[PDB]
Design an enzyme around this catalytic site. Structure first.
Site, PDB file in Angstrom:
ATOM      1  N   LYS C 159       0.810  -1.230   0.000  1.00  0.00           N
ATOM      2  CA  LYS C 159       0.000   0.000   0.000  1.00  0.00           C
ATOM      3  C   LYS C 159       0.841   1.277   0.000  1.00  0.00           C
ATOM      4  O   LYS C 159       0.632   2.162  -0.824  1.00  0.00           O
ATOM      5  N   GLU C 185      -4.226   9.318  11.806  1.00  0.00           N
ATOM      6  CA  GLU C 185      -3.213   8.292  11.580  1.00  0.00           C
ATOM      7  C   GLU C 185      -2.438   7.943  12.846  1.00  0.00           C
ATOM      8  O   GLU C 185      -2.242   8.790  13.719  1.00  0.00           O
ATOM      9  N   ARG C 186      -1.956   6.704  12.924  1.00  0.00           N
ATOM     10  CA  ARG C 186      -1.062   6.235  13.983  1.00  0.00           C
ATOM     11  C   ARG C 186       0.227   7.030  13.947  1.00  0.00           C
ATOM     12  O   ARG C 186       0.843   7.159  12.899  1.00  0.00           O
TER      13      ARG C 186
END
Lengths: 76, 45, 464, 516
Positions: C159, C185-186
Site C-alpha cells: 500500500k 493516523e497512527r
C-alpha cells in the site's frame, strides 16, 4: 477616563464547600481558581478530581472513601 | 443619560452584571462611579 | 474586548464575551494554560452561540490544566493554514503549525480552511479519464481526473509502495504535486511514512498533514479540511494538477460523530451525527476539477463490520468514482502493484466514455481471469492433469494475462536501479487484445513479470 | 448585434421606477444561533412559516413561535449568522417566484438563479403549502406519458397524473432513465398545441455537482433545455435547501399545471430529502421514531406527492406526473422509506443491480415492478400487442431458475425458455436512445408474435434495430398508420408481416448461418 479610574478603584487560599453528594460524585461550590483535573482534598482525608467546572460549582468525582462525604464539608 | 453611558461603556456594563458577586461592593462601585438624586436612587435600588 | 472562559466540560469550553464583540462562528480563539508541567497555548473553535453573549467552543488540544476565568483572545478569522511552494516537503498539524521544524512557515500566506466549493458555472461538464500510465489501473479500472478513488488493503500488500508510485506519477507525468492527509493516523505509521518518503526522496514534492489519534476529535475532524485547503491553493493559484491522499476517511466520519455528541446534538441511525451527508458533502464536493485544473483524490476507506449499508460507507461510496482493492493472494504471487483485477471496479469504464475496443478488451480480460479464478480450486485439489485441453489452453493464457498486469513501477527504482515504465493507453489496449488472442503463449511466465510495455516484452523474451 | 439604447433604457427604467414605500415594520434580533437553526426575539407580527431575511442576504423559515422567541430554520449559508444581528420580515408566507421564465434555467430551491446566466423574469409568486386538489377536482388518469424505454412502456406504462417510483440500488441507471424520459418529450414539444406540449422539471437533491452539470449538458445536447427547469440542491449546501428542493420543484410545476399545461417532475432523489428532514428535526430536538426518522416523514412525502394529479376539465385539463427516485440499501425493498413511498405512489419500476452488472439495461425487475393505473393510459396498439408480455416474462424467470440444473425437460418448457430468453434480449436498449411509440409497438410485435423464433439470441438486438430502420426508410405507412390511429389495423399488419418475411429471407445471421 473617569469610568476606567472607577473600575481600577473597584477592582488565604480559597476553600470550597460541598453543596451536593451522591453515588460517588460531589459538587463543590466556590474555588474560583481551580483547574480542570486538580486534586481536591476533603476533610475525611478522601480525594476528588474536579473533573467538571460549571458556572456555579465544580463537579468532582471521588476516589474511594465516598461514604465520608456530607453537605457543608470544607474542601481544600 | 445613564442608559447611554452604560451602553457606550461595555466593560463597565459587564462589570455591573453583579448578581453572582457580592452586591454591596457592586453598589458601592456604582455609587462611586455615578446629577438627579432620585434617578441615582432608582439606579441603586 | 477579550472574553472569559466561563464553563469547562471535557474538550468542550464555553466563553463569554463583551456584548458587542461576540465572534462569528467557526472563528479560532486562543486561550492560555499556565501550569508549569502543562504549559500550552490552547486553540478553541467556535461551534454555537448560546445567548447571553455565551459562545460554545470545542478545543483543538487537551483542556487539562485550564482554569475558569482565564482570558480568551479572538483571532477574527477561521482556522488558517499556510499555503505556498515552501509547504512542500514539510509536516504540519491540522492548525498549520509545523512538526518537522517548529515555527516554520509563519511568514507564508494563510487561507481559511472553511471555504465554499466551486460555483456551478465553473465545473467541467464531462468526465475525463486520467492516463496514469499503469497497465492494470488504465485497463481494468480507469481513474477519473478530479474524481475520488477508494483504496483497500493493509500491511504486506504494497500500500505504501502504491502511494510512492502515484506521487512519482503525478510529479513526473503531469508536473503536479501531492498532498497527504493523515486523518487520524497512527503516530508510528506517520513516522514510518515520513521516513519512507524521505528515503525515496519524493518528500521534496509532497506536503504532509497529520491529525494524530492522540488529539481530541476537533483536530481529527479539521485535518482533512486543512489538507484540502493546501490542495485548493495549488490548483487555483499555482495552476497545477494535485493528488490528495486521505487515510482514513472513516475516521473523518467518526471524529464528526464524536464532536456532535460532545455538542449534545441528538444522534441518528447507528449513532452518527445528524448532519452526516452534508458534513461529508462539504468535504467531498470541494475535491473537483475547474478551469482545466484538477484535484484528484485517493481515499482509504475502512468499512465497519464489512457491510456496505452502514451510513458511514453508504454515504462515502455515494461520492467516489473508482475502487482499487489490493489483495494478499495477488501480492504473494509476486504481482506488483498487487491490484486485484476482479475485486477492484471503476464507474468510468463504459463504451461511451472510453473507446469500444477498450471496453471490449477489459470485458475479455475480466472473463478470462474470472474463469481462472473459478478453476483455481480444481487446480489446487486435483492438479492440471485433471483438466480438458480446451480449458487448459485458457489457463495457459490466464497465467500470462495475470503476470502481464504487473509493472516495473517507479517506486521500485530505489531497490532495482532499473527505471520505471509509463505505457501509453493505446499501447496497453493493443497488448492485452493480442495477449487474450494468445499470440504470446509460446513465452514462459518469467518473461511477463515486472515487464512494463510490449516492446520490453519483446526484449525480455529474447534475453531469456 | 448589440446596441447602447437597450442598456441605457434598462438603467433609466430602474432609475425612474425606483421609489421607497418607507413602510413601518417590526425588526427582531437573533438571540441564539447554531448548526443551521436560529432563535429570534421580537417580531410580534410574524406569520408562521413567514420567510425571514438576515443581514448577510440569507433567508429563514419561522417554524416555531414561542411566547418570547421565534425558532427559524436557516436556508443557505448559515455561517454568516451571529447573535445580535437584526432580522426583518419579507411579508410573504414561504413561497417561490414562478412563471414561464424558468424554462431553460437552473435555480436553487429559493428560486434564485445558480447558473450565473442572468436574473429571472418571474410572473408571480406561489406559496409552497397550498393544498393538493380535492377528490372532486381530480379526473381519472387516461393519457400516455411516453418514456421511450421499451421495458417501461410495454409492461409499466406511465400516464399523465401518475406517480411512478423509480426505486433502485446505487448506480443502476435511475438518473439515466429519467433523463431518457425528459429527452423523449422533444418530439412532442416541437408541436404548438398545449395538449401534447409536455414541459418538465428536474429537481436534484444531494447529487454531486458534476452529476448535475452532466445532466445539464446531456439535456442541452438533446435540445431538452428549451422546456426543462432544474432545481439544484447539490450535496454541498445546507440541510434546509435539500429539504425544500422537492417542494419548490412542485411549486414551479403547479403554476403551469393549474393553467392547463402538462408537467413532468423528476425527484432525484427523494431519500436524500428524507435524510435532510431527519437532520432538521433532530437539530430541533424532536424525538426520533423508526430508523431515527421523525414521526412525520410520511407527512413529508405524501404532502409532496399528492400535488401530482390530473385535474378535471372544469378546472382546466392540466396535469403533473411525478417520477420520485429512491435509493435502496442493498435492495431491501422492505426498508422504512422505500415502503413509505411505495404506499403513496401509483406503482414502481424496481431496478435490480444483479441484472445491471450482467448488461440487462435498463435493469427493470419485471417480477416486482407494477403499474396500478395499468393499461388505462396505454395506447390501444401497445395494449393489444404487449399486454401479455409481463406475466410471460415473470414465468420465464421462475422457469429459468428451475431449469438452470435440469439435465433435460419437456418441449413446452424448452420452447417457453427460448422465447423468454429472446424476449429479455429484445427489451434492452442503449443509453440516450428514446424510441418513439410508433416504433416501440413494432419492436414488441416482433417478440410477442414469435417472428423472432428463427433468430439466435446473439442476433436479436441487431435484428430489431436494423428492421426498425428498414421500415423507417421504406414502408413508412406502418408507422404512419399506427401513429395516426393509435391502433394496429389488420390491413397494416399484413404489410408488416410481409416486410418481416422479406427481411428474414435476406437476413445474414451473426454466427455466419441463415434462417427462415
Amino acid at each position: 477616563x473617569x469610568x476606567x479610574x472607577x473600575x481600577x478603584x473597584x477592582x488565604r487560599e480559597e476553600i470550597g464547600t460541598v453543596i451536593d453528594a451522591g453515588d460517588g460524585i460531589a459538587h463543590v461550590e466556590g474555588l474560583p481558581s481551580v483547574m480542570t483535573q486538580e486534586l481536591l482534598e476533603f476533610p475525611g482525608g478522601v480525594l476528588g478530581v474536579a473533573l467538571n467546572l460549571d458556572e456555579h460549582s465544580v463537579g468532582a468525582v471521588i476516589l474511594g472513601e465516598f461514604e465520608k462525604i456530607e453537605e457543608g464539608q470544607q474542601v481544600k | 443619560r445613564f442608559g447611554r453611558v452604560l451602553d457606550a461603556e461595555p466593560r463597565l456594563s459587564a462589570l455591573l452584571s453583579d448578581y453572582t458577586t457580592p452586591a454591596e461592593g457592586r453598589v458601592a462601585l456604582l455609587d462611586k462611579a455615578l446629577v438627579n438624586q432620585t434617578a441615582a436612587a432608582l439606579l441603586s435600588q | 474586548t477579550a472574553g472569559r472562559v466561563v464553563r469547562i466540560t471535557g474538550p468542550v469550553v464555553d466563553v463569554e464575551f463583551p456584548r458587542g464583540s461576540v465572534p462569528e462562528l467557526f472563528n479560532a480563539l486562543h486561550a492560555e494554560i499556565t501550569f508549569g508541567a502543562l504549559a500550552k497555548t490552547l486553540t478553541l473553535e467556535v461551534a454555537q452561540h448560546l445567548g447571553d453573549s455565551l459562545v460554545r467552543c470545542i478545543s483543538m488540544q487537551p483542556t487539562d490544566g485550564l482554569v475558569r476565568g482565564v482570558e480568551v483572545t479572538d483571532t477574527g478569522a477561521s482556522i488558517s493554514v499556510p499555503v505556498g511552494d515552501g509547504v512542500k516537503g514539510h509536516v504540519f498539524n491540522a492548525l498549520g503549525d509545523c512538526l518537522d521544524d517548529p515555527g516554520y512557515g509563519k511568514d507564508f500566506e494563510h487561507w481559511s480552511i472553511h471555504r465554499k466549493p466551486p460555483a456551478f458555472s465553473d465545473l467541467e461538464p464531462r468526465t475525463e479519464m486520467l492516463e496514469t500510465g499503469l497497465k492494470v489501473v488504465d485497463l481494468l479500472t480507469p481513474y477519473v481526473r478530479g474524481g475520488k478513488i477508494a483504496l483497500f488493503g493493509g500491511a504486506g500488500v504494497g500500500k505504501t509502495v502504491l502511494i510512492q508510485e502515484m506521487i512519482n506519477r503525478i510529479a513526473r507525468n503531469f508536473g503536479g504535486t501531492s498532498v497527504f492527509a493523515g486523518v487520524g493516523e497512527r503516530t508510528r505509521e506517520g513516522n514510518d511514512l515520513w521516513v519512507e518518503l524521505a528515503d525515496a526522496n519524493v518528500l521534496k514534492d509532497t506536503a504532509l498533514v497529520f491529525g494524530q489519534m492522540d488529539e481530541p476529535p476537533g483536530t481529527r475532524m479539521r485535518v482533512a479540511l486543512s489538507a484540502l485547503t493546501m490542495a485548493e491553493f495549488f490548483r487555483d493559484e499555482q495552476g497545477q494538477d494535485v493528488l490528495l491522499f486521505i487515510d482514513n476517511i472513516f475516521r473523518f466520519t467518526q471524529a464528526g460523530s464524536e464532536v456532535s455528541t460532545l455538542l449534545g446534538r441528538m444522534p441518528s441511525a447507528v449513532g452518527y451525527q445528524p448532519t452526516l451527508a452534508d458534513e461529508m458533502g462539504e468535504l467531498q464536493e470541494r475535491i473537483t476539477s475547474t478551469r482545466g485544473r484538477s484535484i484528484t483524490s485517493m481515499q482509504a476507506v475502512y468499512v465497519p463490520a464489512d457491510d456496505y449499508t452502514d451510513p458511514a460507507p453508504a454515504t462515502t461510496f455515494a461520492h467516489l468514482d473508482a475502487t482499487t482493492e489490493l489483495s494478499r493472494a495477488v501480492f504473494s504471487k509476486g504481482i506488483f502493484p498487487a491490484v486485484d483485477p476482479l475485486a477492484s471496479s471503476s464507474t468510468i469504464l463504459d463504451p461511451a466514455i472510453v473507446g469500444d475496443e477498450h471496453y471490449r478488451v477489459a470485458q475479455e480480460v475480466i472473463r478470462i481471469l474470472q474463469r481462472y479464478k473459478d478453476l483455481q480450486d480444481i487446480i489446487a485439489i486435483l492438479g492440471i492433469d485433471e483438466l480438458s485441453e480446451e480449458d487448459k489452453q485458457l489457463v495457459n493464457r490466464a497465467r500470462r494475462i495475470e503476470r502481464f498486469l504487473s509493472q516495473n513501477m517507479m517506486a521500485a527504482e530505489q531497490f532495482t536501479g532499473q527505471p520505471g515504465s509509463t505505457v501509453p493507453l493505446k499501447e496497453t489496449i493493443e497488448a492485452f487484445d493480442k495477449l487474450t488472442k494468445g499470440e504470446f503463449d509460446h513465452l514462459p511466465e518469467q518473461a511477463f513479470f515486472l515487464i512494463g510495455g510490449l516492446d520490453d516484452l519483446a526484449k525480455k523474451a529474447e534475453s531469456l | 448585434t448589440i446596441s447602447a439604447a437597450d442598456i441605457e433604457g434598462a438603467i433609466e427604467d430602474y432609475v425612474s421606477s425606483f421609489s421607497a414605500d418607507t413602510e413601518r415594520e417590526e425588526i427582531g434580533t437573533v438571540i441564539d444561533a447554531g448548526d443551521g437553526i436560529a432563535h429570534v426575539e421580537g417580531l410580534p407580527s410574524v406569520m408562521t412559516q413567514e420567510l425571514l431575511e438576515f443581514p448577510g442576504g440569507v433567508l429563514g423559515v419561522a417554524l416555531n413561535l414561542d411566547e418570547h422567541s421565534v425558532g427559524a430554520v436557516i436556508l443557505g449559508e448559515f455561517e454568516k449568522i451571529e447573535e445580535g444581528q437584526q432580522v426583518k420580515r419579507t411579508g410573504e408566507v414561504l413561497s417561490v417566484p414562478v412563471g414561464d421564465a424558468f424554462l431553460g434555467r437552473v435555480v436553487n430551491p429559493l428560486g434564485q438563479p445558480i447558473d450565473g446566466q442572468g436574473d429571472i423574469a418571474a410572473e408571480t409568486r406561489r406559496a409552497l403549502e397550498l393544498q393538493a386538489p380535492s377528490v372532486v377536482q381530480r379526473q381519472s388518469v387516461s393519457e400516455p406519458l411516453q418514456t421511450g424505454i421499451k421495458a417501461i412502456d410495454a409492461m409499466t406504462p406511465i400516464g399523465r397524473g401518475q406517480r411512478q417510483l423509480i426505486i433502485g440500488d446505487r448506480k443502476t441507471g435511475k438518473t439515466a432513465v429519467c433523463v431518457d424520459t425528459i429527452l423523449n418529450q422533444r418530439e412532442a414539444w416541437l408541436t404548438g398545441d398545449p395538449k401534447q406540449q409536455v414541459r418538465c422539471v428536474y429537481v436534484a437533491i444531494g447529487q454531486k455537482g458534476t452529476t448535475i452539470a452532466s445532466v445539464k449538458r446531456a439535456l442541452e445536447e438533446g435540445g431538452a433545455m428549451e422546456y426543462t427547469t432544474i432545481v439544484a440542491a447539490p450535496a454541498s449546501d445546507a440541510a434546509g435547501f435539500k429539504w425544500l428542493a422537492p417542494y419548490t420543484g412542485s411549486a414551479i410545476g403547479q403554476h403551469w399545471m393549474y393553467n392547463g399545461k402538462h408537467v413532468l417532475i423528476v425527484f432525484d432523489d427523494l431519500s436524500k430529502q428524507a435524510d435532510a428532514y431527519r437532520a432538521i428535526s433532530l437539530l430541533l430536538r424532536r424525538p426520533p421514531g423508526r430508523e431515527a426518522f421523525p414521526g412525520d416523514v410520511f407527512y413529508l412525502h405524501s404532502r409532496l406527492l399528492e400535488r401530482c394529479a390530473k385535474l378535471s376539465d372544469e378546472l382546466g385539463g392540466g396535469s403533473m406526473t411525478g417520477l420520485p427516485i429512491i435509493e435502496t440499501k442493498a435492495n431491501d425493498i422492505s426498508a422504512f422509506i422505500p415502503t413509505n413511498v411505495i404506499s403513496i405512489t401509483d406503482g414502481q419500476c424496481f431496478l435490480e443491480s444483479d441484472l445491471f452488472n450482467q448488461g440487462v439495461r435498463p435493469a427493470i425487475n419485471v417480477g416486482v415492478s407494477v403499474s396500478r393505473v395499468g393499461g388505462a393510459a396505454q395506447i390501444k396498439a401497445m395494449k393489444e400487442v404487449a399486454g401479455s408480455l409481463r406475466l410471460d416474462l415473470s414465468q420465464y424467470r421462475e422457469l429459468e431458475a428451475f431449469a438452470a440444473f435440469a439435465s433435460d425437460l419437456d418441449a413446452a418448457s424448452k420452447a417457453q425458455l427460448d422465447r423468454g430468453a429472446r424476449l429479455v434480449e429484445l427489451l434492452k436498449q442503449p443509453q440516450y436512445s428514446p424510441l418513439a411509440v410508433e416504433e416501440q409497438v413494432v419492436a414488441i410485435f416482433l417478440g410477442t408474435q414469435g417472428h423472432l423464433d428463427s433468430v439466435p439470441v446473439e442476433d436479436v438486438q441487431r435484428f430489431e434495430s436494423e428492421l426498425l430502420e428498414h421500415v423507417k426508410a421504406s414502408h413508412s405507412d406502418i408507422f404512419d398508420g399506427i401513429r395516426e390511429t393509435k391502433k394496429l389495423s389488420e390491413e397494416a399488419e399484413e404489410k408488416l408481416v410481409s416486410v418481416i418475411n422479406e427481411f428474414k429471407k435476406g437476413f445474414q445471421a451473426s454466427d455466419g448461418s441463415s434462417v427462415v
